[PDB]
Design a protein around this nucleic acid. Structure first.
Ligand SMILES: Nc1nc2c(ncn2[C@@H]2O[C@H](COP(=O)(O)OP(=O)(O)OP(=O)(O)O)[C@@H](O)[C@H]2O)c(=O)[nH]1
Ligand SMILES: Nc1nc2c(ncn2[C@@H]2O[C@H](COP(=O)(O)OP(=O)(O)OP(=O)(O)O)[C@@H](O)[C@H]2O)c(=O)[nH]1
Ligand SMILES: Nc1nc2c(ncn2[C@@H]2O[C@H](COP(=O)(O)OP(=O)(O)OP(=O)(O)O)[C@@H](O)[C@H]2O)c(=O)[nH]1
Ligand SMILES: Nc1nc2c(ncn2[C@@H]2O[C@H](COP(=O)(O)OP(=O)(O)OP(=O)(O)O)[C@@H](O)[C@H]2O)c(=O)[nH]1
Ligand SMILES: [Mg+2]
Ligand SMILES: [Mg+2]
Ligand SMILES: [Zn+2]
Ligand SMILES: [Zn+2]
Lengths: 351, 346
DNA sequence: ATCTGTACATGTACAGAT
DNA sequence: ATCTGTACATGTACAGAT
DNA sequence: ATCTGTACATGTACAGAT
DNA sequence: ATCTGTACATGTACAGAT
């Protein structure tokens, strides 16, 4: 009932060292070769540095090591941003210059830069004979260049081109990241001293803010006590709750295409808010994993029904606004969550 | 009570402003001089350390601690006679070498000479250079705002540099600040100041590590921040420093004791009692009293290990005579059992 | 001769294996 | 409870450039 | 190789609220 | 007496300019 059953699900979700080892060896080979090709010659992307992000590098990837996220980030000095129609997250970017090939009268085209980035990667991937690796068909309005690796087992790698700016963060984030009562003001001041990132979303010239680096730090430094989850401190169940929520969404999403609008970033955003609401490490005791997961489920259901889930970093941006996800989709997911909740999570046994 | 003592010890905003603006004028000018030359100390950077910059200075802003740190390349250390804290150094600076050995005395002397020269050229501030104490690592400036202000200018070598093996068991913050903090702190450089054990020796300095700890001292990240709870850790350090300053004023028998003994002791207490709730402001009396008992127990056992170099006993019979320690135990036991009368004398 | 972008060397938190 | 592979931060060597 | 500009932590000082 | 909110002050990390 309480602690158990969910501990059994977590056992299923745990990655195996052997799988991790084989997956990481291939992924690192491909990524380091693509990073090297970016440094060659008159490449506009010379200087890009690598930044590993997403669930695998936060240690909340579940089931298999089959999806990796890596940012190829390019420091770009004197830039001026114009917010795209008070949306908070989307921007136009303006200013001998290797990026002039993508300029458009002051304005740096996102899809032109991404196309050349994409073109380079496809070419370098053709020269790989070690590995069975190809490039996925492009999704319109997607920042990523996704590699598909057959190791025999299947592995996705989303390479995200990112602009790196070191100025202070855009005003729309000033009230975001409300970690003052949880990680504190010094951590917040230091995190906002780090660069911010822009990824390719006036349709084709817009960029979107990314905070994958800040999210990575928070996930690996998630406690009010510095010793949380350390070898001389107490274990918490924050990440374990994130895993169970991720797994509930993944299971439901591979069954019902009604849920196409939903994604793991909604789960990640919601639990960041829960962690803020419940800052104390004792509110995430491993013994109370059932209650901790249940109160996360209830908070997510409230967000669905009230149609309100604010971006953790950009408070005026509501990821559940009617313009992004239709009410019926949200009602559909509310019922499937409430059902799983009241019937012993039968979907955790599925497959 | 103890609150009233802390109100007396609080520095005044006005005095801080006047003293800092004078001190910064002098320090800036000396630092410029070390850069602008064929100076062999070209490259020194400033690092503000000690109680004023840790926010545990008491009574008046009349003592300032500044390191001019100089990054040096491939240096090898040899530990001086198993002491832990004292090293010979080996491999611009050729003017201070010996037989492969970089001389603390010879480098300090030139450092000292340059500073005294620049001080002669200062005609807007009343500022002299105190007579040198043998063995000491400091160049001390005496400023008269009109009030008296001390500035200890400490030359420091910077290496980076796995910390020397004598510190491997040091800094035992794992259950308090944690392993990530400890690992990151020990990724910082380590420092060497020209305190002689004789003439060629340097001593390990961890002033940059103690500063981080003083300002990052809670088990909770929010300790003492605007969205956290206040603790009484620093106020306990202030009262313990005040007890010792007042006792040292009065008895020359305590000349061998210094505020760093108190700082070392409270680092150990803070490790013993990591929880922030064990330093609740409402328990200021219990907290000060358990700090008193811990310090007495150190005196009674003649054992107070360097927080960063655990084999180095600051209370060894070699460093402080048994009689001095018994004298300080009786005077502390006395103040304790009579309501600290020494806190009432201005 | 000296300089330097790249990659190795070192150390350890995290978390899976045992 | 201990042992151990990956990721990562920082320090340092050096073939190839200068 | 040096310096200002910016942002906010750490303080002190004091009135009004509690 | 203590707490909370605002005003006032210094110290410090680091971006951007030079
Ligand atoms: C802002 N950031 C996003 C969005 N989607 C993804 N990200 C960021 O991109 C990272 C990787 O994306 P995903 O692979 O889709 O999600 P994940 O965090 O790695 O979790 P998984 O489903 O296990 O892969 C996330 O951790 C986020 O930081 C979004 O819609 N808005
Ligand atoms: N590391 C990182 N990866 C990102 C980020 N944003 C997107 N990605 C990757 O790119 C994938 C596609 O991003 P999205 O466009 O937001 O996801 P989507 O499935 O296309 O959903 P929508 O575009 O919102 O309709 C994500 O799943 C991530 O793997 C980011 O900010 N950081
Ligand atoms: C190692 N470091 C020392 C020793 N003495 C002083 N220090 C360091 O130098 C700093 C400044 O020393 P002091 O001015 O004498 O003491 P303080 O900490 O500033 O405290 P005050 O008495 O208020 O001046 C200390 O905080 C220590 O980090 C010592 O004996 N061994
Ligand atoms: N910032 C800093 N200052 C130091 C350090 N060590 C010494 N000092 C300063 O130099 C002063 C004299 O240092 P001491 O360690 O007392 O040397 P000493 O007076 O010759 O020897 P003692 O008799 O043991 O006191 C201290 O009061 C500090 O102000 C250090 O490691 N860092
Ligand atoms: Mg992912
Ligand atoms: Mg001092
Ligand atoms: Zn934890
Ligand atoms: Zn505190």
């Amino acid at each position: 009932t309480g602690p158990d059953k969910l501990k059994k699900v977590l056992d299923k979700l745990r990655l195996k060292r052997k799988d991790i080892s084989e997956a990481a060896e291939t992924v690192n080979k491909v990524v380091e070769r693509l990073l090297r090709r970016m440094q060659k010659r008159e490449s506009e992307f010379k200087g890009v540095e690598q930044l590993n992000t997403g669930s695998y590098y936060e240690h909340v990837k579940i089931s298999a090591p089959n999806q990796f996220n890596v940012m190829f980030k390019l420091e770009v000095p004197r830039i001026e941003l114009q917010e795209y129609y008070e949306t908070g997250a989307f921007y136009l970017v303006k200013f001998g210059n290797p990026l002039s090939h993508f300029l458009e009268g002051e304005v740096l085209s996102a899809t032109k830069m991404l196309s050349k980035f994409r073109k380079i990667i496809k070419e370098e991937v053709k020269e790989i004979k070690d590995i069975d690796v190809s490039v996925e068909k492009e999704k319109p309005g997607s920042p990523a260049v996704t590699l598909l690796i057959r190791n025999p087992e299947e592995i996705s790698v989303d390479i995200i081109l990112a602009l790196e700016s070191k100025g202070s963060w855009p005003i729309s984030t000033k009230e975001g990241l409300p970690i003052q009562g949880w990680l504190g003001t010094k951590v917040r001041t230091n995190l906002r001293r780090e660069p911010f990132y822009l990824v390719p979303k006036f349709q084709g010239e817009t960029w979107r803010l990314s905070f994958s680096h800040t999210e990575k730090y928070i996930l690996n430094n998630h406690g009010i006590e510095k010793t949380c989850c350390e070898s001389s401190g107490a274990k918490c169940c924050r990440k374990e709750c994130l895993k169970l929520m991720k797994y509930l969404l993944e299971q439901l999403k591979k069954e019902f295409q009604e849920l196409d609008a939903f994604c793991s970033y909604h789960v990640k955003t919601a639990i960041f808010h829960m962690w803020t609401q419940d800052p104390q490490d004792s509110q995430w005791d491993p013994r109370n994993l059932s209650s901790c997961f249940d109160k996360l489920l209830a908070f997510f259901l409230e967000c669905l029904r009230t149609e309100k889930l604010d971006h953790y970093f950009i408070p005026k941006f509501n990821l559940f606004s009617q313009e992004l996800i239709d009410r019926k989709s949200k009602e559909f997911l509310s019922k499937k969550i409430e059902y799983e909740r009241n019937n012993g999570f039968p979907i955790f046994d599925k497959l």
